[PDB]
Design a protein around this ligand. Sequence first.
Ligand SMILES: [Cl-]
Ligand SMILES: [Cl-]
Ligand SMILES: [Cl-]
Ligand SMILES: [Cl-]
Ligand SMILES: [Cl-]
Ligand SMILES: [Cl-]
Ligand SMILES: [Cl-]
Ligand SMILES: [Mg+2]
Ligand SMILES: [Mg+2]
Ligand SMILES: [Mg+2]
Lengths: 273, 266, 266, 266, 273
Amino acid sequence: IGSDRVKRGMAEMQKGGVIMDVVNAEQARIAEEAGAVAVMALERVPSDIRAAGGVARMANPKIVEEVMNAVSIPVMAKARIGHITEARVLEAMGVDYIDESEVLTPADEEYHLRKDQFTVPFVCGCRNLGEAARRIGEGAAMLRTKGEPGTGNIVEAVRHMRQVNSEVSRLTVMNDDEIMTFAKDIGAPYEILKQIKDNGRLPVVNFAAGGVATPQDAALMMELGADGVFVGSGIFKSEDPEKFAKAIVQATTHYQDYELIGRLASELGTAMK
Amino acid sequence: SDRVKRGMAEMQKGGVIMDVVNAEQARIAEEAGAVAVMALERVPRAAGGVARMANPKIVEEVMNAVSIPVMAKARIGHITEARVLEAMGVDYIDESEVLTPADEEYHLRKDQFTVPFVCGCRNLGEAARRIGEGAAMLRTKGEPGTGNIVEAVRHMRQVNSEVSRLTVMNDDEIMTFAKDIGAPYEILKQIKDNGRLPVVNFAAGGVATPQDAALMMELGADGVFVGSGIFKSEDPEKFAKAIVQATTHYQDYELIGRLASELGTA
Amino acid sequence: SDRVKRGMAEMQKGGVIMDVVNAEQARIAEEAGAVAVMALERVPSDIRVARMANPKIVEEVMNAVSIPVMAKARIGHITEARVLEAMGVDYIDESEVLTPADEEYHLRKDQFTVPFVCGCRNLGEAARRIGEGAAMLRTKGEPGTGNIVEAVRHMRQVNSEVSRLTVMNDDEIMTFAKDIGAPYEILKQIKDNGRLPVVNFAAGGVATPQDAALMMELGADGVFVGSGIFKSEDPEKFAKAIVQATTHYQDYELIGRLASELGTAM
Amino acid sequence: SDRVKRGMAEMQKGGVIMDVVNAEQARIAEEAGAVAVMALERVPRAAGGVARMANPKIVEEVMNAVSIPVMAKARIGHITEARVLEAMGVDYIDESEVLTPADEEYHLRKDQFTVPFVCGCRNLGEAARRIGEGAAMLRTKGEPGTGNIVEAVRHMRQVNSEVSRLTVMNDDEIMTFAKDIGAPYEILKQIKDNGRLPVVNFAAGGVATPQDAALMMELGADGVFVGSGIFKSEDPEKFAKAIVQATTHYQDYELIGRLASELGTA
Amino acid sequence: IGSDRVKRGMAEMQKGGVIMDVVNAEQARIAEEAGAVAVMALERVPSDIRAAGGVARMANPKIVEEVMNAVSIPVMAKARIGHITEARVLEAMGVDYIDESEVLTPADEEYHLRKDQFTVPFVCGCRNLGEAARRIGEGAAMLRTKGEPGTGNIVEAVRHMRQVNSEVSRLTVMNDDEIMTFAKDIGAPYEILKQIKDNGRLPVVNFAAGGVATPQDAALMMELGADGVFVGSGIFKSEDPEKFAKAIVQATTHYQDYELIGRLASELGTAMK
Ligand SMILES: [Cl-]
Ligand SMILES: [Cl-]
Ligand SMILES: [Cl-]
Ligand SMILES: [Cl-]
Ligand SMILES: [Cl-]
Ligand SMILES: [Cl-]
Ligand SMILES: [Cl-]
Ligand SMILES: [Mg+2]
Ligand SMILES: [Mg+2]
Ligand SMILES: [Mg+2]
């Protein structure tokens, strides 16, 4: 169901961009006006999710369409891992992407969605080439570091991006007759690995996500080789989300303009661990 | 006589059974479209104490407020609790691990009763022993009172996987499969000749939203139990109708999406 | 070009392949009814460092018979297999019976034009060998022991997990594949094919007509035999006995008839 | 170009570098005789949270209040944080484990920068890897923010002991010394031909009293870092001058005794 | 750099050929006659060193001299690991290379020779990039797999060669700011590993050694990325050493001529474990 070309093709249009977890119209248009290339709709931002605890389910559909009605950029929404019904509901709503998101308390602790049997594209989280390849093999069209969401600490996301990238590059120059047992050893589908090698990188875009709290943070992920940046708590849990948003957008676009980043950097206190 | 008992269980297939605490709740359930109600004293309770059966005044009040079948819970292995409810004329007893067990080693001989029983399970071994004792209905154990669907998903997947694997198992391997999972070897041979369970297996344990109940039907259940999900929530009567409609129309994603418009539990 | 490699392998479905060490054993094999022969220097039994056979021994067996010839090569030994392929053998057996040359990596059999056969013991090893381009599988068994039990375990083990897979949920095959070490793509094909997309022969320990019949009863697509034939009294009758027993594995009166020789392997 | 960088580091030898939080502090430091200042947002902080680099307004304010070199900290491995400070024109960046690391496996490639770096260490292995990455300065890690000198004593003793032991090590034993301590084998051969470290190694971590700073100089340091010791204390400007004077006149025990007249930290 | 260029240059001159363990002039002539690019003087071939056991020291200098007189191809001799004066004596005899061979009883179990302070070039054993880098940093000009000498079993040489090449190739595409941690993790000199990346491969030739018993064996190591082949027990503990020799040489240089290797191989009777 669907096409890989179409799903992956669309996700690539956000390359270089910043995506913003938002909770209402106001946050949504703030996201759009500040330069976000897509929004992510949710009921409460990952910082409040770990605080509130409880069971984190998908958002009320009322919330999602109120955001879709606020913005001209693509709207993403989260669904619980394996929650077949939540994804189908979101997809019928016509969201541009669903995030099978480990930020939400799962519904299935052993099996993820068969995302190839959907038409809406899916973004899936990961921490290494084995997880990336299982999600890709399930039909994911976009990848992002799992990171450590809601902590404003970038280190975990740095670790994951570094690990996926390292394993991928190792595979791109790996002996053909060593790939099967490489795949065995990391728990990855042999043919996805064989694709990845021939493509010379991942066949989907791999964003950074979790603990981006400062412009330098975002520019750092791009320096580390991310295809783009998610950020939710870091922006709206700050003294001026409007300024923080435009700072993180410019910093991600000009991640090597070090004096623009320092200039931009003059704002105020932000999220903490 | 198992044909009678199981056959009355099947008349619930596809429906929603709701835990109810008094008569308002009882017919709020019935008005909203429930196929049955569970009479109980505290919805899943994790307050504390010892959970025994309801007072019979509470069961009787519930049977006297609706025409859809009424079930009630008894502690595991509590011979007189089950016999008392059976004399009251409930339609089903649930020998329910939601209540403090009275016997921690041996369940009731439900074949030596005339009222049909529903018992919980988590895998084919528990489902086969409860069937062998004479259960006429099965439900996942799940994780009641938590509003988290994940454990019921795990149990539905485990029961169904082992069932479906048994349906195509070599004849001469079923004995030592039965040894390995702890199951009556004849109940397993029955399950193979039937290609599914001889009883209906409902989901139960933390159904909180319309999409929850629908997910369970998508996953292969025959129906849905729901208790805390409804009344522990903002405007329950609306929650009731939505969960009933989602459980019947569980692939109508536009309908489920609309239905989802309210404010959940926790 | 995998359909053509796998299609030739099916030409032996139902037959008996025989380890022969020279022209006259190769002729005995063909006379008795072998569908193919395995050229090799020391039979699996009295093997117990083992490299490929001298090419001279191999071509002698090609020269003696008109049914296809296979020869073994050490696991992962690129130039042993390349030499064999360029001598024109019909199949190469990347065989664990020989001392492995690469303990971590097998050959990329898809990058060859001669079709390959590999051993396995479970759906995991099977899928990985198929993923590398094996065209035909055999149980690893316990070669040279005249004892069938390991081949029985391997056959039963492969067939159970295949069966489990033909009815396994779609959204579970990835976690299955991870848990058993299998290429996910191959398991989805096995499901769609309803069986393994290559033929799986029983190998290792077949010592009597009854053994060859048992393996076929158990689901195999054919039998490999080596030791139990020539390390017995009158190998020529032992061959004809086993060949007939394999094609008529449910003609039990014939097998008992046929079972009328003397001493055997181990 | 390492000669340039390290040579500007040496112009601090014998002095005191002070953590400062705004401009008053900054020139209180300079008035009292500091050789350099560390710009930071919270003096060692053990309050909590995530410690990132200072806001550039805070760094700029500090550089605009003194003429002695200004340093600032960046999280370990935070490529853009270091690049940002480098564009601001600080004199040194400290890749500082006092701040929450941004990379927990890999430190910055400091040779690919033009501003000199100071990095922490606890032994010759950490000192040799930081040097090999391009550090132009070393400081003990110690135990910052605790006012306890003991961990910096331990680290100075360990670095110096291993250095001095390396200076007289047999040529043909340095490789497997380098393996054992985790160090670049060329950096170790350099250290031997030089008879000491090629950079200056300052003490840092809980200098609270004049006798503390002097003890570090007695122990073989090239200088003293101090942050909490000064401003977290009764009348800091007096503490400042006393620690500057004790670090220069570190064997003048009558002078240190007089200087010690005030009231410490905790 | 400098006299390393010369040392390494001279070892490269045997790239593609076969070096042969010989023990007297007649064996040494067979080697040269059959096409060897070099010979290795020793007193027992690794098969007998294993069976006799005892203490295996350098060869008696007559045996070496007898061998250098008998041939015009370079002569190598073995010395115990870390035996300073065994190497110095061999150097003064004018051998062309010394093998600091772990096939001999190590005289030093903790510290190898400082090879950069000799003028004769050295070949060293290894099993992974850590050992390789440490031998290079000590001044080796040539590497070889440690294999499992005397066993006639190629599997160990295959593992060592596959590991080295895997770690090398992974290094050639490895991030600059990760080579420190990589070097630490494997026990390698950080600067040698930065070299290996720059040159895009090992800066010295790395031969296969230990267990070559048939032409197919030798050809396989060439197939695996070896720069050349050592062989000792495999020849002279076989039916016809002279025919085994030329067949090995031919098969090493034409290691993708499967028609030829097959032809060559049809003269057998070999060694085993
Ligand atoms: Cl996020
Ligand atoms: Cl009873
Ligand atoms: Cl219930
Ligand atoms: Cl066999
Ligand atoms: Cl860098
Ligand atoms: Cl400090
Ligand atoms: Cl050797
Ligand atoms: Mg900032
Ligand atoms: Mg809801
Ligand atoms: Mg004091």
